[PDB]
Amino acid sequence: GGIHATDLNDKSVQRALDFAISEYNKVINKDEYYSRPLQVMAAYQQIVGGVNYYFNVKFGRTTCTKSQPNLDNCPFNDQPKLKEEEFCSFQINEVPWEDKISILNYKCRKV
DSSP states (O other): OOEEEEOTTSHHHHHHHHHHHHHIIIIIOOOSEEEEEEEEEEEEEEETTEEEEEEEEEEEEEEEETTSSOOSSOOBOOSTTOOOOEEEEEEEEEETTTTEEEEEEEEEEEO
16 A cells, blocks of 8 residues: 555556646646646555556646647747746546546646
């Protein structure tokens, strides 16, 4: 039941992160432009009935609108006062055998 540090080079860890980014852009952040991670610290914890992932993520605003097909490889806005970076911590729970995943808690603060 302990929480261990891990990297993004793990298929499962990546999927959990993608879910956090999607939720950040869809529900938490209200900007017109898409934000993606500048930094990420990850940890995981195995519990009865699933696994929890913990992420400390620093988001940066990109030059892509949230409504355009291609994203992820979107350049970050590099203009003064238009960066709009934010640090968020996410607690994500998944059931590694039922395709179930959800956000348990999160806290964001602009950098």
